[PDB]
Motif scaffolding. Structure first.
Motif, PDB file in Angstrom:
ATOM      1  N   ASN A  13      21.628 -21.545  65.420  1.00  0.00           N
ATOM      2  CA  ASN A  13      21.831 -20.531  64.394  1.00  0.00           C
ATOM      3  C   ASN A  13      20.834 -19.381  64.511  1.00  0.00           C
ATOM      4  OD1 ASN A  13      19.876 -22.628  63.251  1.00  0.00           O
ATOM      5  ND2 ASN A  13      19.696 -20.985  61.733  1.00  0.00           N
ATOM      6  N   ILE A  14      20.047 -19.349  65.587  1.00  0.00           N
ATOM      7  CA  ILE A  14      19.048 -18.297  65.747  1.00  0.00           C
ATOM      8  C   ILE A  14      19.729 -16.939  65.888  1.00  0.00           C
ATOM      9  CG2 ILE A  14      18.923 -18.562  68.249  1.00  0.00           C
ATOM     10  CD1 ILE A  14      15.836 -18.039  67.909  1.00  0.00           C
ATOM     11  N   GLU A  15      19.080 -15.920  65.332  1.00  0.00           N
ATOM     12  CA  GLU A  15      19.543 -14.551  65.495  1.00  0.00           C
ATOM     13  C   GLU A  15      19.457 -14.152  66.960  1.00  0.00           C
ATOM     14  OE1 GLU A  15      21.196 -14.712  62.891  1.00  0.00           O
ATOM     15  OE2 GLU A  15      21.406 -12.537  63.090  1.00  0.00           O
ATOM     16  N   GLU A  16      20.475 -13.429  67.428  1.00  0.00           N
ATOM     17  CA  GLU A  16      20.553 -13.100  68.844  1.00  0.00           C
ATOM     18  C   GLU A  16      19.377 -12.239  69.287  1.00  0.00           C
ATOM     19  OE1 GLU A  16      23.128 -15.126  71.254  1.00  0.00           O
ATOM     20  OE2 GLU A  16      22.950 -15.004  69.073  1.00  0.00           O
ATOM     21  N   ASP A  17      18.956 -11.290  68.452  1.00  0.00           N
ATOM     22  CA  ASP A  17      17.789 -10.479  68.783  1.00  0.00           C
ATOM     23  C   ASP A  17      16.520 -11.321  68.845  1.00  0.00           C
ATOM     24  OD1 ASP A  17      19.900  -8.772  68.201  1.00  0.00           O
ATOM     25  OD2 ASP A  17      19.074  -8.221  66.244  1.00  0.00           O
ATOM     26  N   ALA A  18      16.416 -12.347  68.000  1.00  0.00           N
ATOM     27  CA  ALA A  18      15.254 -13.225  68.016  1.00  0.00           C
ATOM     28  C   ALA A  18      15.287 -14.228  69.162  1.00  0.00           C
ATOM     29  CB  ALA A  18      15.134 -13.972  66.686  1.00  0.00           C
ATOM     30  N   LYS A  19      16.460 -14.484  69.748  1.00  0.00           N
ATOM     31  CA  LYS A  19      16.542 -15.438  70.850  1.00  0.00           C
ATOM     32  C   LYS A  19      15.778 -14.934  72.068  1.00  0.00           C
ATOM     33  CE  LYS A  19      19.578 -16.676  73.616  1.00  0.00           C
ATOM     34  NZ  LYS A  19      18.285 -16.921  74.316  1.00  0.00           N
ATOM     35  N   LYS A  20      15.966 -13.661  72.423  1.00  0.00           N
ATOM     36  CA  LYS A  20      15.219 -13.099  73.545  1.00  0.00           C
ATOM     37  C   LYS A  20      13.752 -12.903  73.185  1.00  0.00           C
ATOM     38  CE  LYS A  20      19.525 -12.678  73.808  1.00  0.00           C
ATOM     39  NZ  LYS A  20      20.576 -12.614  72.764  1.00  0.00           N
ATOM     40  N   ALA A  21      13.445 -12.813  71.890  1.00  0.00           N
ATOM     41  CA  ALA A  21      12.047 -12.732  71.477  1.00  0.00           C
ATOM     42  C   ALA A  21      11.350 -14.075  71.642  1.00  0.00           C
ATOM     43  CB  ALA A  21      11.956 -12.251  70.030  1.00  0.00           C
ATOM     44  N   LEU A  22      12.097 -15.172  71.506  1.00  0.00           N
ATOM     45  CA  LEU A  22      11.507 -16.500  71.618  1.00  0.00           C
ATOM     46  C   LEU A  22      11.478 -16.979  73.064  1.00  0.00           C
ATOM     47  CD1 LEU A  22      10.929 -19.405  69.914  1.00  0.00           C
ATOM     48  CD2 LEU A  22      13.232 -19.808  70.790  1.00  0.00           C
ATOM     49  N   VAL A  23      12.570 -16.770  73.803  1.00  0.00           N
ATOM     50  CA  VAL A  23      12.627 -17.203  75.196  1.00  0.00           C
ATOM     51  C   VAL A  23      11.618 -16.428  76.031  1.00  0.00           C
ATOM     52  CG1 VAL A  23      14.101 -17.387  77.227  1.00  0.00           C
ATOM     53  CG2 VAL A  23      15.010 -17.959  74.976  1.00  0.00           C
ATOM     54  N   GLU A  24      11.470 -15.132  75.757  1.00  0.00           N
ATOM     55  CA  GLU A  24      10.473 -14.355  76.482  1.00  0.00           C
ATOM     56  C   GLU A  24       9.088 -14.938  76.245  1.00  0.00           C
ATOM     57  OE1 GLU A  24       8.817 -10.776  78.298  1.00  0.00           O
ATOM     58  OE2 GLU A  24       8.292 -12.909  78.254  1.00  0.00           O
ATOM     59  N   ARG A  25       8.705 -15.093  74.974  1.00  0.00           N
ATOM     60  CA  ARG A  25       7.357 -15.546  74.663  1.00  0.00           C
ATOM     61  C   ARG A  25       7.097 -16.961  75.167  1.00  0.00           C
ATOM     62  NH1 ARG A  25       5.751 -18.755  69.496  1.00  0.00           N
ATOM     63  NH2 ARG A  25       3.665 -18.162  70.227  1.00  0.00           N
ATOM     64  N   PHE A  26       8.092 -17.852  75.132  1.00  0.00           N
ATOM     65  CA  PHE A  26       7.856 -19.246  75.502  1.00  0.00           C
ATOM     66  C   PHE A  26       7.856 -19.491  77.004  1.00  0.00           C
ATOM     67  CE2 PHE A  26       8.206 -21.204  71.240  1.00  0.00           C
ATOM     68  CZ  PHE A  26       7.233 -22.165  71.410  1.00  0.00           C
ATOM     69  N   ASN A  27       8.590 -18.698  77.784  1.00  0.00           N
ATOM     70  CA  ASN A  27       8.318 -18.623  79.210  1.00  0.00           C
ATOM     71  C   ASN A  27       7.040 -17.856  79.507  1.00  0.00           C
ATOM     72  OD1 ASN A  27      10.936 -19.693  79.129  1.00  0.00           O
ATOM     73  ND2 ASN A  27      11.863 -17.709  79.616  1.00  0.00           N
ATOM     74  N   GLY A  28       6.465 -17.196  78.502  1.00  0.00           N
ATOM     75  CA  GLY A  28       5.193 -16.518  78.648  1.00  0.00           C
ATOM     76  C   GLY A  28       4.019 -17.465  78.791  1.00  0.00           C
ATOM     77  N   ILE A  29       3.954 -18.520  77.969  1.00  0.00           N
ATOM     78  CA  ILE A  29       2.857 -19.472  78.132  1.00  0.00           C
ATOM     79  C   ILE A  29       3.036 -20.278  79.408  1.00  0.00           C
ATOM     80  CG2 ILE A  29       1.321 -21.018  76.917  1.00  0.00           C
ATOM     81  CD1 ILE A  29       4.354 -19.711  75.103  1.00  0.00           C
ATOM     82  N   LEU A  30       4.277 -20.480  79.840  1.00  0.00           N
ATOM     83  CA  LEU A  30       4.561 -21.233  81.052  1.00  0.00           C
ATOM     84  C   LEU A  30       4.157 -20.488  82.313  1.00  0.00           C
ATOM     85  CD1 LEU A  30       8.046 -22.669  80.043  1.00  0.00           C
ATOM     86  CD2 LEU A  30       5.969 -24.014  80.452  1.00  0.00           C
ATOM     87  N   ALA A  31       3.668 -19.251  82.196  1.00  0.00           N
ATOM     88  CA  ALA A  31       3.174 -18.500  83.345  1.00  0.00           C
ATOM     89  C   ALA A  31       1.680 -18.218  83.258  1.00  0.00           C
ATOM     90  CB  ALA A  31       3.943 -17.183  83.501  1.00  0.00           C
ATOM     91  N   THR A  32       0.954 -18.914  82.388  1.00  0.00           N
ATOM     92  CA  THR A  32      -0.465 -18.666  82.194  1.00  0.00           C
ATOM     93  C   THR A  32      -1.301 -19.730  82.898  1.00  0.00           C
ATOM     94  OG1 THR A  32      -0.482 -19.880  80.100  1.00  0.00           O
ATOM     95  CG2 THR A  32      -0.014 -17.520  80.009  1.00  0.00           C
ATOM     96  N   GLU A  33      -2.571 -19.400  83.136  1.00  0.00           N
ATOM     97  CA  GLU A  33      -3.557 -20.321  83.698  1.00  0.00           C
ATOM     98  C   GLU A  33      -3.122 -20.839  85.069  1.00  0.00           C
ATOM     99  OE1 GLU A  33      -6.143 -20.907  79.955  1.00  0.00           O
ATOM    100  OE2 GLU A  33      -6.441 -20.918  82.130  1.00  0.00           O
ATOM    101  N   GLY A  34      -2.737 -19.912  85.939  1.00  0.00           N
ATOM    102  CA  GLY A  34      -2.338 -20.256  87.286  1.00  0.00           C
ATOM    103  C   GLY A  34      -0.893 -20.666  87.455  1.00  0.00           C
ATOM    104  N   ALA A  35      -0.069 -20.521  86.423  1.00  0.00           N
ATOM    105  CA  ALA A  35       1.338 -20.871  86.512  1.00  0.00           C
ATOM    106  C   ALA A  35       2.152 -19.689  87.026  1.00  0.00           C
ATOM    107  CB  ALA A  35       1.861 -21.330  85.153  1.00  0.00           C
ATOM    108  N   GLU A  36       3.144 -19.996  87.858  1.00  0.00           N
ATOM    109  CA  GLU A  36       3.835 -19.009  88.682  1.00  0.00           C
ATOM    110  C   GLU A  36       5.346 -19.219  88.604  1.00  0.00           C
ATOM    111  OE1 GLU A  36       3.046 -21.198  93.072  1.00  0.00           O
ATOM    112  OE2 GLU A  36       1.517 -20.323  91.770  1.00  0.00           O
ATOM    113  N   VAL A  37       5.874 -19.249  87.375  1.00  0.00           N
ATOM    114  CA  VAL A  37       7.230 -19.713  87.073  1.00  0.00           C
ATOM    115  C   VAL A  37       8.212 -19.247  88.140  1.00  0.00           C
ATOM    116  CG1 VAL A  37       9.172 -19.430  85.501  1.00  0.00           C
ATOM    117  CG2 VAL A  37       6.896 -19.894  84.595  1.00  0.00           C
ATOM    118  N   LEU A  38       8.976 -20.194  88.690  1.00  0.00           N
ATOM    119  CA  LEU A  38       9.937 -19.883  89.742  1.00  0.00           C
ATOM    120  C   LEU A  38      11.321 -19.601  89.173  1.00  0.00           C
ATOM    121  CD1 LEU A  38       9.015 -22.900  92.070  1.00  0.00           C
ATOM    122  CD2 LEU A  38       7.716 -20.827  91.704  1.00  0.00           C
ATOM    123  N   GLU A  39      11.915 -20.579  88.493  1.00  0.00           N
ATOM    124  CA  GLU A  39      13.245 -20.416  87.931  1.00  0.00           C
ATOM    125  C   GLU A  39      13.135 -20.294  86.422  1.00  0.00           C
ATOM    126  OE1 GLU A  39      13.187 -21.110  90.889  1.00  0.00           O
ATOM    127  OE2 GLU A  39      15.167 -20.815  91.775  1.00  0.00           O
TER     128      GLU A  39
END
Lengths: 95, 87, 114, 274, 64
Positions: A13-39
């Motif tokens: 039920n998430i708002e569509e505009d908020a979905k890209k706000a959440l997916v962006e930020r949460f793949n954001g921590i997955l690229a910190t401290e030497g992380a190099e997200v591939l897919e």
RNA sequence: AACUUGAGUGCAGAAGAGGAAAGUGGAAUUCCAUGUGUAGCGGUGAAAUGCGCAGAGAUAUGGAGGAACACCAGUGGCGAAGGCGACUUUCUGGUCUGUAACUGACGCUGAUGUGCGAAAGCGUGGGGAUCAAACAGGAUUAGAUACCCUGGUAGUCCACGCCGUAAACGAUGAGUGCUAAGUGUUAGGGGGGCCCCUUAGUGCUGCAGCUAACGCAUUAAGCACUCCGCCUGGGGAGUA
């Protein structure tokens, strides 16, 4: 060195505009401290096998990360627990 | 315990000759790093009694290899005892 | 109502509690084998379950029930006679699902007899 | 942790004290200290109203920020210090642009950790943020009851309430006693449990050590005279010779619920304990 | 009978492959015994792990 | 002085409920709040105590909390033993296969010692759903401080310590080598889905041989060598 696959479910039920706000930020921590997200893939609104917090559907996102620090995935789970949008997550070491 | 790349530098450091891995100078040195790694692990997980049992077998293996080295030649025993910090 | 009232049947080694509720879990009537005057070792019998079911089935027809879902909960001798006691009254049984709870462990079963 | 003294003296056999190892500076600050002149149970008239209170070691008051309201400006923990006026410890904090103030020390707040008040704050130990933004399930201390007043609930060594759910303008909170209650959402808390978790395990030992915190001896009522107490009198030691144990001023004391009825907080207590 | 994990050459059962897993969950999601499905002992273990991972991620029902 | 087969190391692989910590789940039990609901529920060989009519049981929804992880699951796997089954991550132990790159006997056993060690039990502080020693009843009996039923406390759970006992059993010490086979299962290797060979476990029959007999039999209780522990009729007594 270590390769992780992270799959998390966002409430259907998430708002569509908020979905890209959440997916962006949460793949954001997955690229910190030497992380190099591939897919970073989207699986779409699939039907859940059972109700999760009175939800029957949900968005699936799969992100594969690689880093020899492991604190990127721990930081994800710490914030994924707090966030009310993510309702289920799982981190697999893939080798 | 120690990574394979970590083990190799210990091998290169204390190898007698090139292509030597089984001399009682590299085996002793490798165990010393391995012993300290489990010792550091048990500072946090104190009740890992099953892991601690494998540590005592490593200590015995190094102790028997040190007894053999001393009985063979005392010079190499003295050099190995000071470089590794073993008392 | 008109139809779609589920019937829950509790068949055990003792009386068989038969209750007829609407689709949304609102009890209309109920009738156990013990409410029919049955003594022990009569309570858990196919004959008692026969009257136990239809006694609550007649009370359902007054609210106009034409559809029943039989949800059986328990390993009791008076199960099959109970279901045929509903069709004999004309309740148009649609589904036969067993809902006997199965723990995925997580509880200490009470000690068995000796 | 707790240090167990060796039985070198009788008056010191089973004594125990706090090791004071979490403390880092053993001296206060001249500008956040105000005077506390002991009153010893006496009132505006000068009469003993509460008893068992008297002489004790002097103490300076350390102004605490119970209303953590510096919103946005970050703060560094400079030294965790000892407080005599409370069970838990206090921590000096320096704000990112010069001002410094004391707070209550959480469990594992370390020197050099960063803390933030506000509403956009994270959920980490020490940062204060309103109860509308504190997730369901978080341990909170220093909970306000009124918007802007200051933390009141949960402030003593090892005090923690759990945000358990929502209503509308109130959040449900299980206070340490076992009571579930509701507190307005616009009120602030602080994430974490208060430190000195071993304050409750200490043994005093000396009569005089209890008579250093400002306690005075308390006489059992079963030995005062009939004109001093309901349990008094008797030729010899006597049992309580009444239907119920009584209080000095004539009011049942083993069970009588003494909470004023018709209070404006009754609509807010869900279940209760103690 | 044949394993389907040795026959077709699968050396890594994936918990994201729900369609492959639904052949071993019966009518409840109940893991089918390897005698019934004929998979070897080596693959009954990694298939059980994949199924249990799918159940947690709500890609397969615990009960049905 | 010399040597690799013993023992270890190196390299390439394999499987695993091996251990510790922190998280994440689903089913179920109990309790609580409501909606529906009416006279029983529950239990036995029969009862009754007991819970209900102040609305129980049942049913539906929601919430709180604790504990254990159905199916997978097997003469299956791992561990020195005790023991180890939900999933994920982080540390971490051991074992097997192949190769032959290295050391050249560096090995075995092991008194005293030092650690681990099921349940129950104790201390401190928590937690407490279920089941429950004891305790209360209700029955059966001639009696029933028992088996049956109804409840029910410690405990059962966690963190630290202590306890150090079990039919802790394969009732079978550890190491090494030799001695008919047949047929399985687990984890690998090499050849020509199948066949053959082979390594290490785990099983069932079964020769020689051993045994008082039962039986064991390449996982000996056979044939040999090394080391340790233990026994010398039954009570008294594992008691002074």
């Amino acid at each position: 060195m270590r390769t992780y696959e992270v799959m998390y479910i966002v409430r259907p039920n998430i708002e569509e505009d908020a979905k890209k706000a959440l997916v962006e930020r949460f793949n954001g921590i997955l690229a910190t401290e030497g992380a190099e997200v591939l897919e970073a893939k989207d699986w779409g609104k699939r039907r859940l096998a059972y109700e999760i917090n009175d939800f029957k559907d949900g968005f699936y996102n799969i992100v594969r990360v690689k880093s020899d620090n492991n604190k990127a995935t721990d930081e994800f789970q710490r914030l994924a627990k707090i966030s009310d949008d993510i309702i289920r997550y799982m981190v697999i070491r893939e080798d | 315990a120690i990574s394979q790349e970590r083990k190799n530098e210990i091998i290169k450091e204390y190898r007698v000759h090139e292509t030597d891995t089984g001399s009682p100078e590299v085996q002793i040195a490798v165990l010393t790093a391995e012993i300290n790694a489990v010792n550091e692990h048990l500072r946090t997980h104190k009740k890992d009694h099953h892991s601690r049992r494998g540590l005592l077998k490593m200590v015995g293996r190094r102790r028997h290899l040190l007894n053999y080295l001393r009985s063979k030649d005392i010079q190499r025993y003295r050099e190995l005892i000071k470089s590794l910090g073993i008392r | 109502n008109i139809e779609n009232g589920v019937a829950h049947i509790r068949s055990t080694f003792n009386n068989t509690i038969v209750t007829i509720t609407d689709e949304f879990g609102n009890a209309l009537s109920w009738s156990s084998a013990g409410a029919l005057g049955f003594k022990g070792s009569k309570k858990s019998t196919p004959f008692a379950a026969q009257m136990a079911s239809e006694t609550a089935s007649k009370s359902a027809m007054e609210h106009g029930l034409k559809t029943v879902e039989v949800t059986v909960k328990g390993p009791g001798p008076g199960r099959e006679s109970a279901i045929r006691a509903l069709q004999s009254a004309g309740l148009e049984v649609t589904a036969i699902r067993d809902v006997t709870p199965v723990p995925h462990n997580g509880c200490r079963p009470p000690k068995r007899r000796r | 942790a707790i240090k167990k003294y060796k039985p070198i003296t009788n008056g010191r056999r089973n004594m125990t004290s706090l090791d004071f190892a979490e403390i880092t500076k053993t001296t206060p600050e001249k500008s956040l200290l105000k005077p506390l002149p002991k009153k010893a149970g006496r009132n505006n008239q000068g009469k003993l109203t509460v008893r068992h209170h008297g002489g004790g070691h002097k103490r300076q008051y350390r102004v605490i920020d119970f209303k953590r309201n510096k919103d946005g400006i970050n703060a560094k923990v400079d030294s965790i210090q000892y407080d005599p006026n409370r069970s838990a410890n206090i921590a000096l904090v320096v704000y990112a642009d010069g001002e410094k103030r004391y707070i209550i020390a959480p469990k594992g707040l370390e020197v050099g950790q960063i803390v933030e008040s506000g509403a956009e704050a994270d959920i980490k130990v020490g940062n204060a943020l309103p109860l509308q933004n504190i997730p369901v399930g978080t341990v909170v201390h220093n909970i306000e009851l009124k918007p802007g007043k200051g933390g009141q609930i949960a402030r003593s060594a090892g005090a923690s309430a759990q945000v358990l759910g929502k209503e509308g303008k109130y959040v449900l909170i299980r206070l340490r006693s076992g009571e579930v209650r509701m507190i307005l959402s616009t009120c602030r808390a602080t994430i974490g449990q208060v430190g000195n978790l071993q304050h409750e395990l200490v043994n005093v030992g000396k009569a005089g050590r209890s008579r250093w915190k400002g306690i005075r001896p308390t006489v059992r009522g079963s030995v005062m005279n009939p004109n001093d107490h309901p349990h008094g009198g008797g030729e010899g030691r006597a049992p309580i010779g009444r239907p119920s144990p009584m209080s000095p001023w004539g009011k049942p004391t083993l069970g009588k619920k003494t909470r004023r009825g018709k209070k404006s907080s009754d609509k807010l207590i869900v279940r209760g304990r103690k | 009978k044949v394993c389907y994990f040795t026959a077709n050459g699968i050396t890594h059962i994936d918990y994201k492959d729900t369609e492959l897993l639904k052949r071993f969950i019966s009518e409840r999601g109940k893991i089918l015994p390897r005698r019934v499905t004929g998979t070897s002992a080596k693959y009954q273990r990694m298939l059980t792990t994949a199924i249990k991972r799918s159940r947690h991620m709500a890609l397969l029902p615990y009960v049905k």
